[PDB]
Design a protein around this motif. Sequence first.
Motif, PDB file in Angstrom:
ATOM      1  N   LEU A  48      41.726  58.904  88.472  1.00  0.00           N
ATOM      2  CA  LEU A  48      42.496  58.036  88.770  1.00  0.00           C
ATOM      3  C   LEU A  48      41.590  57.214  90.201  1.00  0.00           C
ATOM      4  O   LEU A  48      41.713  55.734  90.637  1.00  0.00           O
ATOM      5  N   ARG A  63      39.298  54.885  88.373  1.00  0.00           N
ATOM      6  CA  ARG A  63      40.730  53.306  88.419  1.00  0.00           C
ATOM      7  C   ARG A  63      40.795  52.672  89.312  1.00  0.00           C
ATOM      8  O   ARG A  63      40.365  52.063  89.770  1.00  0.00           O
ATOM      9  N   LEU A  78      49.797  61.235  94.573  1.00  0.00           N
ATOM     10  CA  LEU A  78      50.052  61.084  93.527  1.00  0.00           C
ATOM     11  C   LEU A  78      51.534  62.755  92.777  1.00  0.00           C
ATOM     12  O   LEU A  78      51.143  63.623  93.558  1.00  0.00           O
ATOM     13  N   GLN A 121      52.019  60.123  87.987  1.00  0.00           N
ATOM     14  CA  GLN A 121      51.631  58.348  88.603  1.00  0.00           C
ATOM     15  C   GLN A 121      50.985  58.556  90.157  1.00  0.00           C
ATOM     16  O   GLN A 121      50.798  59.596  90.805  1.00  0.00           O
TER      17      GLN A 121
END
Lengths: 452, 448
Positions: free
Chosen positions: B15, B18, B247, B256
């Motif tokens: 994450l 990203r 998170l 998510q």
Amino acid sequence: MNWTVDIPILPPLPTDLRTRLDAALAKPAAQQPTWPADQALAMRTVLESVPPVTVPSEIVRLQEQLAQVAKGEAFLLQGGDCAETFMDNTEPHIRGNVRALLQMAVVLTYGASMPVVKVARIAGQYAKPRSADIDALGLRSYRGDMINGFAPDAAAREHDPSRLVRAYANASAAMNLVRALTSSGLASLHLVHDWNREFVRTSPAGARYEALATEIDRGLRFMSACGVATAEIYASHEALVLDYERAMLRLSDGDDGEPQLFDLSAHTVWIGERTRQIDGAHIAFAQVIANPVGVKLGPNMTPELAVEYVERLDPHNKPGRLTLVSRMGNHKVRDLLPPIVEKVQATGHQVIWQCDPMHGNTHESSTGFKTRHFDRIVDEVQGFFEVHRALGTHPGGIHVEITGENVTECLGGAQDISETDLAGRYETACDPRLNTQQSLELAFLVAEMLRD
Amino acid sequence: WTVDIPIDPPLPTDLRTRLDAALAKPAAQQPTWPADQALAMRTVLESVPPVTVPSEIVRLQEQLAQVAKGEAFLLQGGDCAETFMDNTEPHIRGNVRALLQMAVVLTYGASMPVVKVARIAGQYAKPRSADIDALGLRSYRGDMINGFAPDAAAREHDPSRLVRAYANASAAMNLVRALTSSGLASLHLVHDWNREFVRTSPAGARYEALATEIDRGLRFMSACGVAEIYASHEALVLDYERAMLRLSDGDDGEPQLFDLSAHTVWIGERTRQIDGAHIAFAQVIANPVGVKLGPNMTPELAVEYVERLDPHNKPGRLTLVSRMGNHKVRDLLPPIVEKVQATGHQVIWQCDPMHGNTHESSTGFKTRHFDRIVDEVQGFFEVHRALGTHPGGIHVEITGENVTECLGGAQDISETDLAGRYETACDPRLNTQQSLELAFLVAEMLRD
Ligand SMILES: N[C@@H](Cc1ccc(O)cc1)C(=O)O
Ligand SMILES: N[C@@H](Cc1ccccc1)C(=O)O
Ligand SMILES: N[C@@H](Cc1ccccc1)C(=O)O
Ligand SMILES: [Cl-]
Ligand SMILES: [Cl-]
Ligand SMILES: [Cl-]
Ligand SMILES: [Mn+2]
Ligand SMILES: [Mn+2]
């Protein structure tokens, strides 16, 4: 590395509240922090405009629920960290302390067959009293992060008035989160008790507690089967630092529609054993504020002093406004508590009799760490229950120090935590907290005491 | 005059990769403070209790999905610019109150639930078109960045205001929660203020009917036997929004990223570069997001926001905020509604009738003409009625104080009145009366 707040550049009290309050703070106050009265005054001016940590309607509501405890119709569970640290003011720590309290409350509720009022030692427990002003390492004593630093340096143990604001900022942040957690799924009773059935599965002492965790599971399912489908956690700390409590005072129409003074650093606060001077400013501060208040009573308490507290702090006979928190140690509670109860009960005042099986059973360990034995804690609550049952009075609640972490700060329990283990996970900033495993163990046991 | 307050578990690597890539895009309107200090303050905010929790965002996402689907109305309002030194109990208390008053009125006229979203608990940063103001100073960009005071030191960008901003945000959200769960919740109370509005106010006769009609439904409610305020700010300072990322799992089962500094955030007119970091940030978070749309919005670009911010066709997850100006909304909006509707995405058409009707007053102050605000919402409805779409909500700037920042309304605030109580640290706000007045007027627009 630090942030910065501006110092401002609130409405006047009615003359009587002005006088009584100024009168009350004029009196001597033990254990107050030494720091420049002009710096403390700057802090208090910041704190006099900040959004409150609590609001009056919530304190009135707690007063009503505590009246039901006083009257024998509910049970008080008060718990949390011994001392809150700005260091550990983190979501996982708060969540685990909220979870720990909610779990103990389901167990206690089923045991008491009546409602449990949940009050957390949280959102302000940033200050403690010290018997000696110089500690083990010849250093100025740590008094809680509202005052100085746990760090063992000469510079950290200096009393820093800026820690007043730092304490409020941490407090209202933890409170914001507590509010959010208790209105989320975390509060659901069925969710909360599955955490308890996990504990029974994974604990060494599951067998001792499995029958009851299952009886509760069937009570919860019984609810659902009948067509039922949230939580209230109140904030409390020892009102030790009068500068702080002063600033957090706000004025509002109270139980009688006339203006009263509420201390909005919390919902309820208690004066401790080293600060309950009957003619002192702590006790007199407690007489101006509308909050439910408590007083620690240790083994040198006389039935007649206890009565004077009751007559000063509960002048209007408001059941549940005053809690009397017993901490005598197990070997003394059975003998010392009854005479106090008999004389207080005789006045016609309805106090909450809260047990504190922690601050009367501390003892330095053979490792250098200060610890408490599970079996001694149990014995005093038990002894506390034995005494109230004998007299026909109400065992109104407990007052425990706990964390949602698997620390190793208290001996015994299901984990037979030994004196050589107290060094593996001694997280506490002051006194030894029961880890989560010992928290629930006690809640189960105290639930057994509540039954018949 | 001031005092120093001392200071003293990573996200998954897949994450961060990203995220670090998304944040590698170019960010407008950002502070110019040293990145190492920013990094220190971020590491602080990475560990604090969050201002919100995921379950409330998932819950809001559910309530907003009904707004998109036509069966609820969005009420979003609050201060234009929050300041640390007005972040007080009375100020918060009267903005909560005013917002509850408007919601009772709007709920009755809509005949459907009203989601309440406050501009609060984080609205501490604004973009600026010029980095030298009329005093020839570095511009004030919000208390999260620098100080409203005119002087070189105050205007220097101070990353410790990241922490002061969070602190003020927590303390305010802790109070909103207390307020919404106490007596202020109660409708019969909130509306008894609406009937003080009509008693005192000069336009009382214009609103006495609807106010009475509502008091009767409230009594009917009671006769037949019978609050949530969400937080939001413009996501601008990306050192802040990203330090507040946490998170957890939501409407998926997979974990998510939520931005737990607020419940929903919007992206302003000046930061919504389709390939900028702000839009890329909204891509990554699960929060409901909005995007401001000014007059120079191609129907084509509105659609590229919908594809980029509602990739999984989740109704309500994306809101589009009209801010055209009354004189332009009726003509400039319809083609945008059309082009988006035809895409198979359900969004919230929300009306900001203020950020495109600000006119300089002859007496120096920047102000707004009541008749032009009302008229843009009205025109915003006339569009949606004409197109058969859902007028989804209003996005509005208000206060509970009796300030004199806007022109017109009941008190008929004029060019010379603006100097009475011009208390906003940025845009002019409808005072309590004008917030309520507008609330009644929009109730009639929603009427069956
Ligand atoms: N905070 C003041 C007391 C006070 C409290 C509330 C007020 O509204 C006014 C005064 C003090 O410490 O002395
Ligand atoms: N709003 C004031 C006081 C405050 C301090 C900390 C938290 C909330 C409020 C400030 O930022 O200086
Ligand atoms: N606990 C940290 C972070 C924090 C800052 C401000 C408010 C709440 C928490 C501190 O004391 O600084
Ligand atoms: Cl209140
Ligand atoms: Cl730029
Ligand atoms: Cl400032
Ligand atoms: Mn303790
Ligand atoms: Mn604005």
